[PDB]
RNA sequence: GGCCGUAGUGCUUGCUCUGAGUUUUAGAGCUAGAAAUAGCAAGUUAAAAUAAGGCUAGUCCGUUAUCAACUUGAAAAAGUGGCACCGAGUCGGUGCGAUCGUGCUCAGUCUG
DNA sequence: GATGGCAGAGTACTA
DNA sequence: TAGTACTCTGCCATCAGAGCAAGCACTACGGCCGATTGCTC
C-alpha cells in the first residue's frame, strides 16, 4: 500500500498515462507473463500511452443509407409504370420487358435477342438513325398527332420518369413565359393602368439584362432600382420586382396593411399568403400579382431553356436537340479545320483515347473542362476559330445532352411534356386515357421528408404509423399513412426532455404558460422605491396581478415609465391571440387553458397548413371561420426549455401550491425559480431529487455516447476511463489521492472558395475575374486573408498588391499575449502592424473611425464575420479594460470546457461513492483538471522541451507532467481547489500570472527559498535541490509501454470504382451470376482480420499433400460466412484437414516479436508495419530543439544569445544523432537501401548551416518511426517508403496479444505450433 | 513411583479426561449469528495425509464424532516448525467472530508471579493434558463446531463434531478458568499453607518447605483424580528448586531468564530489513522488565521501525545492537514481589527518558521487583531539568498500578516536589490526583539512587 | 452552474430529394490488302446495376459506435497476475514473502 | 491525405 | 530450359448540390438566483 496518483493526457488518436508516488518518482513492478514461452517475468515502470485510430462520425453512412433507399424507390417507379403498360405491352410485343431487363448482358447469357427494342438489326438500326437521341423522340411524341408506337411510347415516359428534376420549386409552372423584356413591360403597363396618379416609365432600360445578371439577387435588385426613376427599394414596384425575382417582400408599407403580409413565390403557401392580401387590401391588385407571377416563370426558365417555345411545347426537348444540332456541325468544322491545317495533329485529337481531346471526351474519362483546357490553344493557333473561340469562352462548344448542369431542371418541365404526350396518344389508346392521373402522381410525388421510412415495425429509423395494414402505393398514401400522426412523433422524437423531470417533455416556447412563468419570474424581482417609503419594498401578489393586468395583458412592450403612469399613477403570445380571436374572456378564462395550449402545441408542431387545420377542427365549434383561417395562419417556432409538469404539476407537499402559484403568491418573500428549487424547507428540491433518481444510469458506453461532442473525442474519453480502471487494478485495487487530466483542444478549400466567391457577388466587385485563384492557392492564409479583405488593407485606407504578398504582416485583433487564436475570425492582414497602434490593446480609435464604413460593408458582404466586427469596433466601445485583461489572462489557466466537465464528471462519479451520515459524499480521489499553457509554461521554463517527430513518448511524459504539475499546484496553494478540482482588477491580475513562480529560483530579481513549503503547515511541497533531477530522470527513462490498439476493421467492402473487364482473378463480381471475366468488377477488397490456418495444399500433378502454415485474408464481405462455417470456408479455398484448435484470430496492429527486439504489426494478410520506438537521449532531443528553432525565438536577447552559443559548442551532436539513426535503423528497421541514400544526403549536405542542418534532420526521424512506412525528404534529396509486403518472416516469431495498458501480456509462440 | 500412585490423574496411564463435575455448557449466539457453511478448502495430498492418522485416533479417543449440522467450516493443517507432522486447525475464524463475547477472566502474566512469595521455596509446577478437552458439550451447542472432513481410505465422510471445548475458540481458555477455578476452590480451602498459582490451564503450587509440597503434590494429584482432569507426566516439574513457568525461571525464590531466550536474542546476525528489526525488538521486548534503562539502551532502533524509512545500520545502531547483546548476557535475577508489603520506587531523568526501579523490602535488603522505562512525551521532555522530574516519577509511578495490586507505595525522589504538585506555577490536575492520593501515593524521605543499580 | 433578451458563428443527428460518374450490351463501319496494315467515315444516346446480399418480405435492412488473451456463462457479463531496494538502451539484478491475554512502538478518530 | 491493393517489370531456384 | 515464386516501383482511390427538423457549444453582452456568526439596539 502506497499513496499514488494518476496523470492523464487526452488526444484525439493517444491516451497518455502515468502512475506516480509523493515524491514524484514513476513505480516499476515485475508482471507475470502468461503463454508457452520460457519467460515468466518482466520488468516494466508504469508510464506509458494508448494509441488508437481516431474516430468517425455517422455522417458517409447516412449518405450511403439514403442514396440506397434513392436507388430502391426508383426502380419501384420504373415497376409501377411497367404494371400499367403490361397488358398492352404483352399484347404488342411479349419480350419487350424481358429483353429491358437484360440488356446488360453478354450475347451466349441473352436468352432474347440482343436489340432490345424491337428485336431485329434493321429496325433496330432504322429507329437509331431516325432519332439519335431521346430527346428527338420525345419531341416528336409531344409534337405529332398520329400513332405512335408504343415501345416509343413507353421508352419516353420512361425516361421523364426515371430522370425527373429538382421539387425546389413549388406550385406550378407554364413554359410559355420565355421573353423576359416583353414580360417587364406587360408588368410595366398593368401597373401603370393601375396607379394612374404616378406612372412608372422603364424605357430604354436593359430589362433582360438586369435581371438576368449573374450577379445575386440582391445585387440585381438594386441596379434595376438604380435604372428605374419614380421608385426605390421597400417602394410598391420594387417590392413587385423583388418578388418577381425571387426576394421575399414585405408589402406592409405599400398599402398600411400593419401585418407583414409576406408573400414568397416559390412557396407552397404563396396562393393563400396572396388570398389573404387580395382579402385584405382588394381584387384591382391581381392581375399585377399574376403579371409578378409570370415574369418569374420566365426570369427562371431563361436562364435554362434558352430557346424559342412559341412553336414547339416541348422547350427543353428543343434546346437538347439545339445543341445537337450545333455539336454537330462545330464538330464537322473542327475536322474540316484541323485537316486543312495540322493534320499531323488529327490523330492525336480524334483518335488517340488517353490524351485528353475529342476521343478522350467521348469515349475517355476526360471532362468538360478537361477538354477546354485541351483545345483552347490548339483553336487559338488556327485562323477562322473565332467563333468557335467565343463558344469556347462562354462555354457552349461541343455539348453532350446529359451533363452535371442539367441539375437546374424543374420536375415541372418533365411533368409537362409528359402530360403533352399522354394528351396527344390517349384516342389511340384507352388504357392511356384511363391511367393518365395516376401516370403524373408516379412522376410527381415524394414521401415527405415528415413521414420518413415506410417501415412495418423493422427498422430503427422509421416512426411512421399506419392507419390500415396494406401496402402502400403513391395512389393510397393519404389513405393508408397516418399524416398528423406521423408528423407529430417526427417533431416529438428528437426534442428534448426535462432535466429536472426527466421523463417529462418541454413546453413550447411560445406557449401561453411558458410566457406568463417568464413574465412572472422577471417581474418578482423588480423593486420599487417611490415617496413615503423608508426601505425598498417587494412588489405583493395583488400588485403583480394588476400590474400584469392592465400592463402585460394591453400592450406588447411594458416600460418602467407606463408602469409607473398607468398602475403607480393612475391608481396608486397573448397579444397575437387577442387580435386573432377577438375574445378577452375566453383568453382569460381559466378552463379553457388545455385548449390554448392544445392550440399552440398544434401551431408548433405543424409546418403545413393542410395538417394544422385538420388538427385544429375539434375547436372548429369554438370559433369561427375566418378566425379558423387566421389561426391556420399564424405559426410559431421554439421549444422551451423546462416542462409543463415542472412548472404547473408538481405541488407544494405542506401547502400545495405549484411553482408558478408561489412566483404570482410570493408576497414580500418574492422567491424566483432558483431559489424555489433550492429551498430546504419547500418540497420541491425533494420531490426534484427523487424524479432525477429514477432510472439512474445507464452503461458507460451508454453515457459517453449520449455525451456531446465530436466522435474520436469520444472514442479517446472511453479509452481513457478503460485505462484508469485497469490502473486500479494493477496497483492493488487501491485508488488514487489525485487524478489530473488535461485535453488538447482540437472540402476546407472548397468551402473557401464558394464563401469567397459569393462574397464577392454580393459586394459586386470583381477581384476573382481580375486574376482567379485555385482552392490549393487560396489554402494560403496570407492569400485567403488578401482575398477576403477585398484586396485592400484593413487598418488603413489603401490598396493592396497579390503580386507584392509573402512581404506584408499578419495582425490579431485581439493581441497574441491576451487571448491565443490563430483563427481567421482574429488574423487580419495589413500593410504594416504598427497602423493599428498601441500592440498591446485593441486597434487604435482613429483606425476604427476611418475604416468603419469598409467594415460594416465587409460584414454585409459576409467577408468578415460579426464577432470579427464587435472586436475591430471594441475601441469604440471603450478598448479592452484591465477586468477584461485579467479574466483574459485568468482563463488562459483554468480549463472551461464543457467536455473536460463531463470527463471529469464521468471519472469522479466511477471514484467517489461512498457516502457520510448525512448523504454527503466522500471526495477521497480529487479530479483536477488543467489546461495545457502551464505545463507547456513549465517545459520551456525548466529546459524539458518537447519534439514531437522523436517518437510517440511525448504523450506519456505529458501525461507525467501533469500529474507533477496538478499535485504540488494543490498541495501549495489549498485555496485554489474550487477552479481546479471537480466538485481587485490588479490583485486578481497578478495573482494568476505568478501562480507558477514558486517553482523557479528567481522571479523577474527575488532571491525564493530552495525547499518550498505550503505554509500554515509543515509539507513540503517542492525541492527544487533533487525534484528537478528527479523529473529527468524520469524523462529520460528508456522504457515506456505504448500500445496500439488493436481493432478489426469494418465498412465498406472495397473501392466503389468498377474496373473493366480484365483476365484477373482479383475482381469481384458485381452480381451473382455477373462473370467479372465478362462485365468488370470491383477489386481492392478490405480484410477484416487475418486468420492463422495450419492445414495441407494438393501441390503439383500429383495432388501431395503439403504441410502449410500461412496467412488467410477474411476479407469485410466474407466474414459472416467465415463465422458461421469456418471448416467449410477453409476448405473450399482448397485446404483440407485444417485444425480449428490451431485457427488464431489476428486482427489489425497484432504485435510479433522476431529477433533482437524487432517488432512488426500485422497491416494486413500481406503487409507488415514498423513495431519499435527510438529513445533518443533528452541532450539530443534539448540540442534538436534549440538548433530549430521550434516555434521561432520566445526567449530575451540575453537567454537567445547563450543558446545559440550553446548550439555552436555543440555542433557536433549532429553526427552522433546521425550514428543513433543508423544504428537503430540497422538493427531494426533493415532498409539498407534508404539508410544509404539518407546517409549520402547528410554527406553532401554537410557544409550547411546548423539551423538547416537541424531542420532536416528532425525529417529523418520518418525513416525510424512507428506505424506504416512513410516517404520523406532530406534537403532535395526524396526517399520513398520501404515497405514491408511480405508476412513469411512472421510465421516463427512470438505473438504477443497486450492488454489496454500493455503491462498485461500473453506470449504465443507461434513456431512450435 | 509417582506415576503408579495415582494412576487416575496422569494421563499416560489415565486415559482420556473428562469433567465429572461441569455440567454441559450452552454456547450461546448473538442475533445476527446464523449457521454459515464454509466447504472444506482443498488439501495437498501429502498435507491431508498428515492429519488422516490423526483423525484415526482422534477418532478411537471419542473426540470427534459424526454429525449432520448446519455448522460448517473449513479443516487446515499446519506443520510443525521442525520435521513434518502436519497437527489439525479447526480453523474457526468465522465462528469465532459470532460467538456471543464473554470477559476474559483470565490472570494476566504480569500479575500471577507477583503473587509467588520468597517464602515458598518448594515448587511443583503440574501441566494439564488436552485441558480444553475436559469440559463436555452440550448436544444443543454440539452443532456449533462440525467440521467437513472426508476420509475414502475408511470411507468416513461428512462433518465431525465436538462433544467437548475446541482449540481455536476465543472463549475456551475463559469458560475452562472459570470451570478449573471452582473445582480447586474446594482445595485451597483445605490446605490454607500451599499456594496454588493458575495460569489458564497451568497450576502451579507453592510450599514452604520439600516435605509440604510432596503432600500437596500428592492430595492434587488425587482431587484432580477424582475431578477427571489428566496431569502430563512427562513435563511436570514435581518438588524442584528451579522450575521454569510462564517463561521464566524461579530459582530461590527470583524470577531468571531461561539460558535458550538469551541465546536466540544474541544468535540472531545484524538485522537488515524492518521485518529484521520488528522480529528482534519485540523479541527483546519480552526481556525488557530485566534489562535496567532498556528503552535508552534501544533508542536508537525505535526510529527504524517506522513504516516509512530508510534501514541504514550506522556504527550507532550496531552499537546500540551489541549492548543489547552484552546486557543479556549478564542479566541479573530478578526479586519475586511481596503484596503484603509496601514499595518504594526510585526514580531519575536523563535527557528526556525516565527509568527506575520498583522495589520491595527482602530481609535488610531490596529487591527489585521490575524495572520501568518509558519515553517523555515530547512537551515534557522539552522542560527544563527540575520539572520534567515531576512527568519522570508520573510514568513511573503509573507503571506501579499494574503489579503493586492498588497496594499502597511509597515514593523517593532527590527533588522533593510534593509541595510544587500542590502549586505548579487540565493534565496537571490529572496529575495532583494520582500523586496527592495519599491512600496509594506518598512521598519518602530524599535521597540520590545510584547511577547504575 | 440556470433562464430569460438580442445577435452571430460552428458543429451534430435524422429524413426526403437532384444531377452526374462508372461498368456491360444496343446503335450493321467502308475500302485496298491473304494477313498484319493503311486510308477514310463515325462519335452527342438508351437499357440495367450502383456496396455481394438478408429475411422479418417492408416502396424494409446492409459502411456509425463497441471488440487484448484465458476461465465461467446461451447471452448480457463476472473473474484471472506478490512486495521492496539498487540501477538503465526498450527493461535488468539483488532480497524477502485459528484464538485469549501480556509487553513495546506507531497511526488515525472524537472530545475538551 | 494516407496507406494498402494491384499490375507490371525484374531476378532466382527448382522440376 | 519453363515455370513458378518472391521483390521492388509507381498509380490509385465516386463526386457535387437542395430543402427540413431537433439539439449542443461558444461568443458578447445585460439582468435576475448562499449561510453562519458576531455585534448592536
Known sequence: ?1313 | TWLSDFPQAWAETGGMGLAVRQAPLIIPLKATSTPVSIKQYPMSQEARLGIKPHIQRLLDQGILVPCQSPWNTPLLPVKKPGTNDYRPVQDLREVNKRVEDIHPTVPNPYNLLSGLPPSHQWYTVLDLKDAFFCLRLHPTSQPLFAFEWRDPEMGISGQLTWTRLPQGFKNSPTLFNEALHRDLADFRIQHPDLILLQYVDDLLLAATSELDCQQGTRALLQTLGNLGYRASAKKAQICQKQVKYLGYLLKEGQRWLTEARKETVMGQPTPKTPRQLREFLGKAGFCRLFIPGFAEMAAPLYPLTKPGTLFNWGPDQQKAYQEIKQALLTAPALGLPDLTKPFELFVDEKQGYAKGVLTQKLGPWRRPVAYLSKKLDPVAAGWPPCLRMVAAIAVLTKDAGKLTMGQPLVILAPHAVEALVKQPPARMTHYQALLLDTDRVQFGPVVALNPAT
Not at chain 1, 113 to 124: M, Q, S
Not at chain 1, 990 to 998: A, D, L, P
Not at chain 1, 1094 to 1113: C, M, P, R
Request: hydrophobic share 35%.
Open chain 1, 1 to 1313: 500500500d502506497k499513496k499514488y496518483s494518476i496523470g492523464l493526457a487526452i488526444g484525439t488518436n493517444s491516451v497518455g498515462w502515468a502512475v506516480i508516488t509523493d515524491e514524484y518518482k514513476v513505480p516499476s513492478k515485475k508482471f507475470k507473463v502468461l503463454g508457452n514461452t520460457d519467460r515468466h517475468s518482466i520488468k516494466k515502470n508504469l508510464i506509458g500511452a494508448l494509441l488508437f485510430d481516431s474516430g468517425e462520425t455517422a455522417e458517409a453512412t447516412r449518405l450511403k443509407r439514403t442514396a440506397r433507399r434513392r436507388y430502391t424507390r426508383r426502380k419501384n417507379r420504373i415497376c409501377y409504370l411497367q404494371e400499367i403498360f403490361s397488358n398492352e405491352m404483352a399484347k404488342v410485343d411479349d419480350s419487350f420487358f424481358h429483353r429491358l431487363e437484360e440488356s446488360f448482358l453478354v450475347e451466349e447469357d441473352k436468352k432474347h435477342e440482343r436489340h432490345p427494342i424491337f428485336g431485329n438489326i434493321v429496325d433496330e438500326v432504322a429507329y437509331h438513325e431516325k432519332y439519335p437521341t431521346i430527346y428527338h423522340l420525345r419531341k416528336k411524341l409531344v409534337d405529332s398527332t398520329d400513332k405512335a408506337d408504343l415501345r416509343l411510347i413507353y421508352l419516353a415516359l420512361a425516361h421523364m420518369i426515371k430522370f425527373r428534376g429538382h421539387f425546389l420549386i413549388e406550385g406550378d409552372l407554364n413554359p410559355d413565359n420565355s421573353d423576359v423584356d416583353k414580360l417587364f413591360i406587360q408588368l410595366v403597363q398593368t401597373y401603370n393602368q393601375l396607379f394612374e396618379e404616378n406612372p412608372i416609365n422603364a424605357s430604354g432600360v436593359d430589362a433582360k439584362a438586369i435581371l438576368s445578371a449573374r450577379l445575386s439577387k440582391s445585387r440585381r435588385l438594386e441596379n434595376l432600382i438604380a435604372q428605374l426613376p419614380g421608385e426605390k427599394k421597400n417602394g410598391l414596384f420594387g417590392n413587385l420586382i423583388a418578388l418577381s425575382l425571387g426576394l421575399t417582400p414585405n408589402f406592409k408599407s405599400n398599402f398600411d396593411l400593419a401585418e407583414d403580409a409576406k408573400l414568397q413565390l416559390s412557396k407552397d403557401t404563396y396562393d393563400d399568403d396572396l388570398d389573404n392580401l387580395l382579402a385584405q387590401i382588394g381584387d384591382q391588385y391581381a392581375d399585377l400579382f399574376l403579371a409578378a407571377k409570370n415574369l418569374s416563370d420566365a426570369i427562371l426558365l431563361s436562364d435554362i431553356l434558352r430557346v424559342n417555345t412559341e412553336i414547339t411545347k416541348a422547350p427543353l426537348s428543343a434546346s437538347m436537340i439545339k445543341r445537337y444540332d450545333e455539336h454537330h456541325q462545330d464538330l464537322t468544322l473542327l475536322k474540316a479545320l484541323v485537316r486543312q491545317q495540322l493534320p499531323e495533329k488529327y490523330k492525336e485529337i480524334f483518335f488517340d483515347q488517353s490524351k485528353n481531346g475529342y476521343a478522350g471526351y467521348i469515349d475517355g474519362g476526360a471532362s468538360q473542362e478537361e477538354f477546354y483546357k485541351f483545345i483552347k490553344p490548339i483553336l487559338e493557333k488556327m485562323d477562322g476559330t473565332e467563333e468557335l473561340l467565343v463558344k469556347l469562352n462562354r462555354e457552349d462548344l461541343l455539348r453532350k445532352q446529359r451533363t452535371f448542369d442539367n441539375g437546374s431542371i424543374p420536375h415541372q418541365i418533365h411533368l409537362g411534356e409528359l402530360h403533352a404526350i399522354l394528351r396527344r396518344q390517349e384516342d389511340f389508346y384507352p388504357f392511356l386515357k384511363d391511367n393518365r392521373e395516376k401516370i403524373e402522381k408516379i412522376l410527381t410525388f415524394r414521401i415527405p421528408y415528415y413521414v420518413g421510412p415506410l417501415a412495418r415495425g423493422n427498422s430503427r429509423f422509421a416512426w411512421m404509423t399506419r392507419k390500415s395494414e396494406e401496402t402502400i402505393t403513391p395512389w393510397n398514401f393519404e389513405e393508408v399513412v397516418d399524416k398528423g400522426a406521423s408528423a407529430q412523433s417526427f417533431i416529438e422524437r428528437m426534442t428534448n426532455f426535462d432535466k429536472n423531470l426527466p421523463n417529462e417533455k418541454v413546453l413550447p416556447k411560445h406557449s401561453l404558460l411558458y410566457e406568463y412563468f417568464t413574465v412572472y419570474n422577471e417581474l418578482t424581482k423588480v423593486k420599487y422605491v417611490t415617496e413615503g417609503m423608508r426601505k425598498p419594498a417587494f412588489l405583493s401578489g395583488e400588485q403583480k396581478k394588476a400590474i400584469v393586468d392592465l400592463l402585460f395583458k394591453t400592450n406588447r412592450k411594458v416600460t418602467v415609465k407606463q408602469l409607473k403612469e398607468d398602475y403607480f399613477k393612475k391608481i396608486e403570445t397573448y397579444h397575437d391571440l387577442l387580435k386573432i380571436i377577438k375574445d378577452k374572456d375566453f383568453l382569460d378564462n381559466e378552463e379553457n387553458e388545455d385548449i390554448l395550449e392544445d392550440i399552440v402545441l398544434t401551431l408548433t408542431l405543424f409546418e403545413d397548413r393542410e395538417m394544422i387545420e385538420e388538427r385544429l377542427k375539434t375547436y372548429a365549434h369554438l370559433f369561427d371561420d375566418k378566425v379558423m383561417k387566421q389561426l391556420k395562419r399564424r405559426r410559431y417556432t421554439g421549444w422551451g426549455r423546462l416542462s409543463r409538469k415542472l412548472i404547473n404539476g408538481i405541488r407544494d407537499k405542506q401547502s400545495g401550491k405549484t411553482i408558478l402559484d408561489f412566483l404570482k403568491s410570493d408576497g414580500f418573500a418574492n422567491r424566483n425559480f432558483m431559489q424555489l428549487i433550492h429551498d430546504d424547507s419547500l418540497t420541491f428540491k425533494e420531490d426534484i431529487q427523487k424524479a432525477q433518481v429514477s432510472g439512474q444510469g445507464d452503461s458507460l458506453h451508454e453515457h459517453i455516447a449520449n455525451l456531446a461532442g465530436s466522435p474520436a473525442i469520444k472514442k479517446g474519453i472511453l479509452q481513457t476511463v478503460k485505462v484508469v480502471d485497469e490502473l486500479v487494478k494493477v496497483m492493488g485495487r487501491h485508488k488514487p489521492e489525485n487524478i489530473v487530466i488535461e485535453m488538447a483542444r482540437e472540402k476546407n478549400s472548397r468551402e473557401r472558395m464558394k464563401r469567397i466567391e459569393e462574397g464577392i457577388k454580393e459586394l459586386g466587385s470583381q477581384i476573382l475575374k481580375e486574376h482567379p485563384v485555385e482552392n490549393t492557392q487560396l489554402q494560403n492564409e496570407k492569400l485567403y486573408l488578401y482575398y477576403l479583405q477585398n484586396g485592400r488593407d484593413m487598418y488603413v485606407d489603401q490598396e493592396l498588391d497579390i503580386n507584392r504578398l509573402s512581404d506584408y504582416d499578419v495582425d490579431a485583433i485581439v493581441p497574441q499575449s491576451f487571448l491565443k487564436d490563430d483563427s481567421i475570425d482574429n488574423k487580419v492582414l495589413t500593410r504594416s502592424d504598427k497602423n493599428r497602434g498601441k500592440s498591446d490593446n485593441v486597434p487604435s480609435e482613429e483606425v476604427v473611425k476611418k475604416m468603419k464604413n469598409y467594415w460594416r460593408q465587409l460584414l454585409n458582404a459576409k467577408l468578415i464575420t460579426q464577432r470579427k466586427f464587435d472586436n475591430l469596433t471594441k475601441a469604440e466601445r471603450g478598448g479592452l479594460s484591465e477586468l477584461d485583461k485579467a479574466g483574459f489572462i485568468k482563463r488562459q489557466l483554468v480549463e472551461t470546457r464543457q467536455i473536460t466537465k463531463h470527463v471529469a464528471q464521468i471519472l469522479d462519479s466511477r471514484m467517489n461513492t461512498k457516502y457520510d451520515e448525512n448523504d454527503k459524499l466522500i471526495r477521497e480521489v480529487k479530479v483536477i483538471t488543467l489546461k495545457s499553457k502551464l505545463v507547456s509554461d513549465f517545459r520551456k521554463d525548466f529546459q524539458f522541451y518537447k519534439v514531437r517527430e522523436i517518437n510517440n513518448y511525448h504523450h506519456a511524459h505529458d501525461a507525467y507532467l501533469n500529474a507533477v504539475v496538478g499535485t504540488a499546484l494543490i498541495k501549495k496553494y489549498p485555496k485554489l481547489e474550487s477552479e481546479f478540482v471537480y466538485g481587485k482588477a490588479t490583485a486578481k491580475y497578478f495573482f494568476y500570472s505568478n501562480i507558477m513562480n514558486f517553482f523557479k529560483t528567481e522571479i523577474t530579481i527575488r532571491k525564493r527559498p530552495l525547499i518550498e513549503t505550503n505554509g500554515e503547515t509543515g509539507e513540503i511541497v517542492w525541492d527544487k535541490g533533487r525534484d528537478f533531477a528527479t523529473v529527468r530522470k524520469v524523462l529520460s527513462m528508456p522504457q515506456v509501454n505504448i500500445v496500439k490498439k488493436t481493432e478489426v476493421q469494418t465498412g465498406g467492402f472495397s473501392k466503389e470504382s468498377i474496373l473493366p473487364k480484365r483476365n484477373s482473378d482479383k475482381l469481384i463480381a458485381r452480381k451473382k451470376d455477373w462473370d467479372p471475366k465478362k462485365y468488370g468488377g470491383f477489386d481492392s477488397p478490405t480484410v477484416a482480420y487475418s486468420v492463422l490456418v495450419v492445414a495441407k495444399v494438393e501441390k503439383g500433378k500429383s495432388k501431395k499433400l503439403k504441410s502449410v502454415k500461412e496467412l488467410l485474408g477474411i476479407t469485410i464481405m466474407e466474414r459472416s460466412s467465415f463465422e458461421k462455417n469456418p471448416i467449410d470456408f477453409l476448405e473450399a479455398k482448397g485446404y483440407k484437414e485444417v485444425k480449428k484448435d490451431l485457427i488464431i484470430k489476428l486482427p489489425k496492429y497484432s504485435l510479433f516479436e522476431l529477433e533482437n527486439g524487432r517488432k512488426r504489426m500485422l497491416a494486413s494478410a500481406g503487409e507488415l508495419q514498423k513495431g519499435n520506438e527510438l529513445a533518443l537521449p533528452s541532450k539530443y532531443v534539448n540540442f534538436l530543439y534549440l538548433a530549430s528553432h521550434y516555434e521561432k525565438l520566445k526567449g530575451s536577447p540575453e537567454d537567445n544569445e547563450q543558446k545559440q552559443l550553446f548550439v555552436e559548442q555543440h555542433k557536433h551532436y549532429l553526427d552522433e544523432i546521425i550514428e543513433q539513426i543508423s544504428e537503430f535503423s540497422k538493427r531494426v528497421i533493415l532498409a539498407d537501401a534508404n539508410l544509404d541514400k539518407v546517409l549520402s544526403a547528410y554527406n553532401k549536405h554537410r557544409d550547411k548551416p546548423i539551423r538547416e542542418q537541424a531542420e532536416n534532420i528532425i525529417h529523418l526521424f520518418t525513416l525510424t518511426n512507428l506505424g506504416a512506412p512513410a516517404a520523406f525528404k532530406y534537403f532535395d534529396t526524396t526517399i520513398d517508403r520501404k515497405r514491408y509486403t511480405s508476412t513469411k518472416e512472421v510465421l516463427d516469431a512470438t505473438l504477443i496479444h497486450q492488454s489496454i495498458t500493455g503491462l498485461y501480456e500473453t506470449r504465443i509462440d507461434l513456431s512450435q505450433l
